Amino acid sequence: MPQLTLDKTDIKILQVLQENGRLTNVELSERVALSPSPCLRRLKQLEDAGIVRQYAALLSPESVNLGLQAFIRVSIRKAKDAREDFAASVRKWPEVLSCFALTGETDYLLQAFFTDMNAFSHFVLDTLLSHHGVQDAQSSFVLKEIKHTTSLPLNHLL
Amino acid sequence: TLDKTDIKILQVLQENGRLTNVELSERVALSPSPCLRRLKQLEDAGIVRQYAALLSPESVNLGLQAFIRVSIRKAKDAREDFAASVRKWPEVLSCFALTGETDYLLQAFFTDMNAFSHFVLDTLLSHHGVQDAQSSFVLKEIKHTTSLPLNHLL
Amino acid sequence: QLTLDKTDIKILQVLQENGRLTNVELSERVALSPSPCLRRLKQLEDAGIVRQYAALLSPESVNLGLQAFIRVSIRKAKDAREDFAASVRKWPEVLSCFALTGETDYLLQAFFTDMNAFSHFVLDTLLSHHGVQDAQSSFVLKEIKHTTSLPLNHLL
Amino acid sequence: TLDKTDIKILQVLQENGRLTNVELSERVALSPSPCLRRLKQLEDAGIVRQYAALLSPESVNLGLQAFIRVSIRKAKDAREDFAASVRKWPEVLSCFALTGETDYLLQAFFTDMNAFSHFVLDTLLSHHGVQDAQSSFVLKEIKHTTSLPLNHLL
Amino acid sequence: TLDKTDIKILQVLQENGRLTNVELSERVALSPSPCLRRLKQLEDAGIVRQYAALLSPESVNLGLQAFIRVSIRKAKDAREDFAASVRKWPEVLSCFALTGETDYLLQAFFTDMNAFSHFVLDTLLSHHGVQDAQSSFVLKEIKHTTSLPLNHLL
Amino acid sequence: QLTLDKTDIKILQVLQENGRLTNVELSERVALSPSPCLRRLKQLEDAGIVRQYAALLSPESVNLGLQAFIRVSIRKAKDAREDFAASVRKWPEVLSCFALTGETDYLLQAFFTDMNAFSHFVLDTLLSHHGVQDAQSSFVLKEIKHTTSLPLNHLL
Amino acid sequence: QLTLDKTDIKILQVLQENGRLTNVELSERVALSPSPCLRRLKQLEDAGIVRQYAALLSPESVNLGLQAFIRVSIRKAKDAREDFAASVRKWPEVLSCFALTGETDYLLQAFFTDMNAFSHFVLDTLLSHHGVQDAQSSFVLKEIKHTTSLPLNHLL
Amino acid sequence: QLTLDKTDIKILQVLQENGRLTNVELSERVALSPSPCLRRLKQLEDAGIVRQYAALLSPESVNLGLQAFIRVSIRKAKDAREDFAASVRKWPEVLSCFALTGETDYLLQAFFTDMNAFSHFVLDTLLSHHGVQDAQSSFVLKEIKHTTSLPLNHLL
Ligand code: MET
Ligand code: MET
Ligand code: MET
Ligand code: MET
Ligand code: MET
Ligand code: MET
Ligand code: MET
Ligand code: MET
Ligand SMILES: [Ca+2]
Ligand SMILES: [Ca+2]
Ligand SMILES: [Ca+2]
Ligand SMILES: [Ca+2]
Ligand SMILES: [Ca+2]
Ligand SMILES: [Ca+2]
Ligand SMILES: [Ca+2]
Ligand SMILES: [Ca+2]
Ligand SMILES: [Ca+2]
């Protein structure tokens, strides 16, 4: 468990790395009041313990022409492995960044990104709705990004 | 504008953000000094907005990830207040104004359904701007990446 | 059907709340002697009025923290209805099951330890059952009220 | 912390709640005295909330089991007044604050539809904090038990 | 031909279907002789489709009056089979094809909720054509009349 | 709250279908003695069973081509419910009004000449009424069945 | 009123597809001399059948590449209906607008450059209008068919 | 591809409202000599900018007094989409059809003379089509606004 593996300073480590993910061990060492050796040791425990799963470069969709962030609610037909064949193909679609099996009226909620609405129609008509397992889709689109952080809260571990 | 090599840099760094300039230069088929100019251009051009360490919710005890469908009152100071308030809720990671049935969509994280209940009943719904909420929960993470698609730039 | 009296109702009304009372105690509550009281309580059991006595447990005390109310709708065949009802009775994590009016056709009441527990039940058991066409599940955030006790003032 | 015979006792009593100590002990591979202690602890520990006689709705003329979905208007203490009122309504057996479209969900019992109409129109819908109500009725009780699952502790 | 007096007739008979031609001829200001010519021509032109005795549903023990919204499976004949089956169900008084979410709306009467369940569960839902159903019940008759409006004809 | 003789039901069954029948013609459709057939109505109508005898007309024949079913929800202000009731009673075009269970609070069954007639009613009368929060109107495309006759075999 | 024959419906039908045709051409297609064709056409305008001659453009060709249908709900004020009507009429991007039956009270058809533009309109114009309670917007993914042409063969 | 200028748009804006103008009448309005203006317009037609000149009619003048906005759901079988598309294109009472985002997959604009006409269509042609799973129809009570004119100022 994290209270019997992650002490106060490790939590600050993940807090800083979550936000400035490309620091060097020494930059981080300066950031958490620690000698470069044990700091490195700690950041290695966390990476091997599964806590830090990935370091990534986050981009601006608008800058790379992606104007239309769509949240699509999908329902899967009662077929053999409709679930798994949908799941298999959703991982192959680069435009679809995330997919989740949700509670409620919808079975699946997908988070996608596209350039313009024409782009989106060809994907919805020719890929999503054309897929044997996909029974019905409902697409909504983002009008304003009020908030967007990859950072999880860690004060519950304290 | 940016060329096929600038698109290879971004594709690569989206997956391994911490990747070294030697390694990066190698995969993008460029020398160390010149390719490190592109990456600095790109960072200085805003294309790359942040470098982040992505964590595993299970590992840090956030075993409950929710999507909450919220709607604000027909008010002037309801819009900004809810926004200003969601920005200060660390449990709440993203928030969006959607088209369609619901006006706002929140994506947040919790430990247990108990943690959630206190948040929804004592923070969210008691916010003067919030008119109604409707929260669903993630049963199975089929796919989740922070990597944007870049083939359209080719 | 058994013809009930004022004392007969008081007995039920006592038993529903404290169902482990000794007959000596139940007799003194409802203002009766053991012998008569015992014959009543037995007549009330005989009649089918009392269907069972039950020890009621605290869900959180036994690690079930997540209480799901699940709206199910079953496939349209002259078999899915009985198969689903048959399976529902074999599922111990589901306590109640009701065929309802309105949008949802079936309503289930189920208890689980965590949300991950639910995910296995819904994905691997409920929604893979040939009869189940769709599910919509909610969760209890706060128990405002929960009694097992039926009202009996309409009999007086 | 509950062992194998602590759990089985709970299993036995959840079904046959009025057993003698002697016939309870016979059903758990335990002698009277030990079994009486293991039960005492379970009660003092909060595990056994109460012992209740379960009756038949049909038996006592209650032929209409309604599951009602009500929402509450946004006003100071509307939820507390609803809660406190629903606790003094004997026809209402249980009431839960829920995730999803509905704010609340009651399970009520009535002699017939006329009885229901009077409750809904002149007590539920007339309470100040009650904004809306959607009632549905049970057509067939496929399963009903009070007995919680306990095989997760084994 | 539907001049004022022909409407004064229709209006009166809708309310008092049983009225004597003497009394009818009096309320519409006509000698009996032509009042009986006019009415017969209304009876034989189709206008008056039926004279009917309207009964109190509670009086004959049918307390439960339902409104069911039914959708037929989209195949061949199903539409006709559900139609013809609905015509042989005496508890179903009216059945309309409506616009909107639901495809058919049924008005039906029952003795009690138990009588309703048998019907929904063993007839309505078990009919090969019926895809699904959604039943709502009448808590109070605010108004009910068989009299059409006819002012527009004036 | 009772049950009547086998042919006493027929009296109601016959009258519901042919309501302006002569007691002579009635006594011939129920196998009842001539004048004692008038005696039996003298017990039914003279009780509460028969509420009214009415002339049922053809909507199309009197120009009423459009029959709407309107789902109306009511504002929760002080006695807004009786206000609505008080007004639906006065609107001739609205034939029947019921307080339903489910999503919508009230259901109205109305008749109109054409859609323009419905617009004026909906905009200028229904939705402009102080108690009416929302309305949701659906129209009939085809009358599969319509009888004013109740089932009476539950009484045998 | 006018009495339209097969020649006159042919006039309107040709004009509906080809609005700009020369009077000589029009008369050639519709089997009439220029002299009366001209009269008959002007009779259809003066009558009110021809309400407007218009050139219809391709949205994409004018960068308006985002067509939205918007379902709007007016709050219950007294003037809310007319205020919204008035403001709707001044909004050029909103081309048509309808009081519909059903769940939605108003249906709008609008054209925008792209979602950014759409966001500005909903957040800063539509939802900030005092009489507007709610907005549920959808977009066109594929234009299967779109004509201004009405069917007129029911008049024959 | 052609670039549009301040004058070019005026030609667009004027034509959109007054479609049947003569070339002389258009020239003396956009600040262009008759000869240039002639060509420029033909290049806009040829460029796809102006897609069709139409005479627009009054529904109520030609007895089409029921405007239905229909929401259809297509059966997701083997290319049922193309079939519905191909037959929607033949149905004259249907002027427009769109693949929408959100609850419904399709949205139709239809025009009828009355409810009888609508019934005949929805029951015996639309819902009897093999690709059509569900249909949900509404009707306009009031046209607040209707223009064919697109906005063009975003090009200035
Ligand atoms: C494959 S995810 C299933 C979700 C489930 N039916 C629910 O909404 O509760
Ligand atoms: C005919 S395409 C239908 C698209 C679907 N309604 C959506 O929301 O994505
Ligand atoms: C907070 S912005 C809400 C937008 C609205 N849901 C729409 O569909 O237009
Ligand atoms: C009375 S608590 C209401 C909870 C809220 N409707 C939700 O979905 O989270
Ligand atoms: C049985 S006719 C069905 C009509 C369809 N529900 C509509 O609204 O258009
Ligand atoms: C399995 S019984 C289903 C009944 C149906 N949902 C109704 O509303 O009447
Ligand atoms: C106008 S009474 C409304 C009753 C409410 N719709 C219910 O379902 O209980
Ligand atoms: C602004 S008119 C609203 C009409 C309403 N939606 C109905 O169905 O009757
Ligand atoms: Ca909404
Ligand atoms: Ca809890
Ligand atoms: Ca999990
Ligand atoms: Ca809600
Ligand atoms: Ca009743
Ligand atoms: Ca409601
Ligand atoms: Ca487009
Ligand atoms: Ca944007
Ligand atoms: Ca009209």
Short mmCIF file of C-alpha atoms in Angstrom, two decimals, chain D residues 4-153:
data_model
loop_
_atom_site.label_atom_id
_atom_site.label_comp_id
_atom_site.label_asym_id
_atom_site.label_seq_id
_atom_site.Cartn_x
_atom_site.Cartn_y
_atom_site.Cartn_z
CA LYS D 4 -14.91 -19.52 9.05
CA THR D 5 -17.43 -20.33 11.84
CA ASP D 6 -18.06 -16.61 12.47
CA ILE D 7 -19.15 -16.36 8.81
CA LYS D 8 -21.28 -19.55 8.75
CA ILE D 9 -23.22 -18.41 11.84
CA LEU D 10 -24.02 -15.20 9.98
CA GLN D 11 -25.05 -17.35 7.02
CA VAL D 12 -27.34 -19.53 9.15
CA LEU D 13 -28.99 -16.65 11.08
CA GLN D 14 -29.48 -14.41 8.02
CA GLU D 15 -31.88 -17.13 6.81
CA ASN D 16 -33.19 -18.62 10.13
CA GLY D 17 -33.07 -15.55 12.41
CA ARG D 18 -35.08 -17.03 15.33
CA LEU D 19 -33.00 -20.16 16.09
CA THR D 20 -32.41 -21.42 19.64
CA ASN D 21 -28.76 -21.27 20.74
CA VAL D 22 -28.83 -25.07 20.86
CA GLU D 23 -30.15 -25.50 17.28
CA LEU D 24 -27.83 -22.71 16.06
CA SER D 25 -24.80 -24.43 17.61
CA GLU D 26 -25.92 -27.72 16.04
CA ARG D 27 -25.65 -26.05 12.62
CA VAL D 28 -22.10 -24.63 12.91
CA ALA D 29 -20.06 -27.50 14.40
CA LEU D 30 -19.91 -25.67 17.73
CA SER D 31 -21.24 -26.33 21.23
CA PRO D 32 -23.80 -23.91 22.78
CA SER D 33 -21.47 -21.83 24.97
CA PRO D 34 -18.75 -21.00 22.34
CA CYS D 35 -21.37 -20.26 19.68
CA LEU D 36 -23.17 -17.91 22.12
CA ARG D 37 -19.96 -15.90 22.52
CA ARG D 38 -19.12 -15.80 18.80
CA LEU D 39 -22.63 -14.42 18.25
CA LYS D 40 -22.41 -11.90 21.15
CA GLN D 41 -19.26 -10.41 19.63
CA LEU D 42 -20.88 -10.15 16.18
CA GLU D 43 -23.74 -8.07 17.66
CA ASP D 44 -21.57 -5.78 19.82
CA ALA D 45 -19.30 -5.34 16.78
CA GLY D 46 -22.16 -3.80 14.79
CA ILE D 47 -22.27 -6.75 12.33
CA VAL D 48 -25.81 -7.87 13.25
CA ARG D 49 -27.90 -4.68 13.11
CA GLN D 50 -31.22 -6.18 14.18
CA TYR D 51 -33.38 -9.30 14.12
CA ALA D 52 -36.62 -8.85 12.17
CA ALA D 53 -39.69 -10.89 11.28
CA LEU D 54 -40.31 -10.54 7.54
CA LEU D 55 -43.99 -10.47 6.55
CA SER D 56 -45.91 -11.05 3.31
CA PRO D 57 -47.26 -7.87 1.65
CA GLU D 58 -50.17 -9.94 0.20
CA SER D 59 -50.93 -11.36 3.65
CA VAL D 60 -51.62 -7.90 5.08
CA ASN D 61 -53.48 -6.40 2.06
CA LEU D 62 -50.38 -4.53 0.81
CA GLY D 63 -50.75 -5.49 -2.85
CA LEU D 64 -48.92 -2.57 -4.43
CA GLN D 65 -45.14 -2.28 -4.09
CA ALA D 66 -44.02 1.02 -5.61
CA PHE D 67 -40.46 2.07 -6.47
CA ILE D 68 -40.54 5.88 -6.74
CA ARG D 69 -37.89 8.19 -8.24
CA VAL D 70 -38.16 11.75 -6.86
CA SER D 71 -35.99 14.82 -7.40
CA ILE D 72 -35.66 17.74 -5.00
CA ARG D 73 -35.69 21.46 -5.81
CA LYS D 74 -32.56 23.51 -5.13
CA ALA D 75 -33.25 25.25 -1.83
CA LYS D 76 -31.69 25.54 1.62
CA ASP D 77 -32.30 22.31 3.57
CA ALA D 78 -34.68 20.80 0.99
CA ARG D 79 -32.86 17.45 1.21
CA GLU D 80 -32.87 17.36 5.01
CA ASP D 81 -36.62 18.12 5.24
CA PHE D 82 -37.36 15.43 2.64
CA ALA D 83 -35.12 12.95 4.48
CA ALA D 84 -36.66 13.81 7.86
CA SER D 85 -40.18 13.57 6.40
CA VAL D 86 -39.57 10.25 4.60
CA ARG D 87 -38.47 8.80 7.95
CA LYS D 88 -41.94 9.48 9.44
CA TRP D 89 -43.83 7.95 6.50
CA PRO D 90 -44.54 4.31 7.44
CA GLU D 91 -45.56 3.31 3.90
CA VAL D 92 -41.99 4.21 2.83
CA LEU D 93 -39.70 1.29 3.76
CA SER D 94 -36.38 2.45 2.27
CA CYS D 95 -34.93 5.56 0.62
CA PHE D 96 -31.58 6.05 -1.11
CA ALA D 97 -29.74 9.00 -2.62
CA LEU D 98 -28.65 7.67 -6.02
CA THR D 99 -26.20 8.19 -8.86
CA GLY D 100 -27.71 8.85 -12.29
CA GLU D 101 -30.80 10.68 -13.52
CA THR D 102 -32.75 10.34 -10.27
CA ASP D 103 -31.60 12.09 -7.11
CA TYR D 104 -33.55 9.75 -4.83
CA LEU D 105 -35.27 6.34 -4.93
CA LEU D 106 -37.89 5.12 -2.45
CA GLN D 107 -39.47 1.67 -2.07
CA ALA D 108 -43.03 2.03 -0.76
CA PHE D 109 -46.00 -0.23 0.08
CA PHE D 110 -49.70 0.43 -0.47
CA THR D 111 -53.00 -1.42 -0.27
CA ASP D 112 -54.01 -0.37 -3.81
CA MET D 113 -53.71 2.39 -6.47
CA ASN D 114 -56.27 4.61 -4.69
CA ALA D 115 -54.06 4.46 -1.59
CA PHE D 116 -51.07 5.33 -3.74
CA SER D 117 -52.79 8.25 -5.42
CA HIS D 118 -53.54 9.83 -2.06
CA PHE D 119 -49.94 9.37 -0.85
CA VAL D 120 -48.34 10.76 -3.99
CA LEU D 121 -50.68 13.73 -4.59
CA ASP D 122 -51.34 14.74 -0.95
CA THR D 123 -48.05 13.87 0.86
CA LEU D 124 -45.13 13.20 -1.51
CA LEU D 125 -45.85 15.85 -4.18
CA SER D 126 -47.18 18.39 -1.63
CA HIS D 127 -43.94 18.41 0.44
CA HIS D 128 -42.13 21.71 -0.25
CA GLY D 129 -38.75 20.20 -1.22
CA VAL D 130 -40.25 17.66 -3.65
CA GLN D 131 -39.96 19.01 -7.23
CA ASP D 132 -40.72 15.90 -9.30
CA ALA D 133 -41.70 12.20 -9.02
CA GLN D 134 -41.65 9.15 -11.30
CA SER D 135 -43.41 6.11 -9.85
CA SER D 136 -43.16 2.49 -11.06
CA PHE D 137 -44.78 -0.64 -9.65
CA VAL D 138 -43.63 -4.24 -9.22
CA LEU D 139 -45.39 -6.71 -11.53
CA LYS D 140 -43.61 -9.88 -10.30
CA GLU D 141 -41.14 -10.43 -7.42
CA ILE D 142 -38.50 -12.62 -9.13
CA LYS D 143 -36.22 -12.60 -6.09
CA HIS D 144 -36.25 -11.02 -2.69
CA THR D 145 -33.88 -11.73 0.19
CA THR D 146 -32.44 -9.76 3.09
CA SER D 147 -29.38 -12.04 3.21
CA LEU D 148 -26.11 -10.35 2.22
CA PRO D 149 -23.37 -12.28 0.39
CA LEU D 150 -20.49 -13.39 2.63
CA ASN D 151 -18.30 -15.68 0.44
CA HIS D 152 -15.92 -12.75 -0.20
CA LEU D 153 -14.61 -13.01 3.42
#
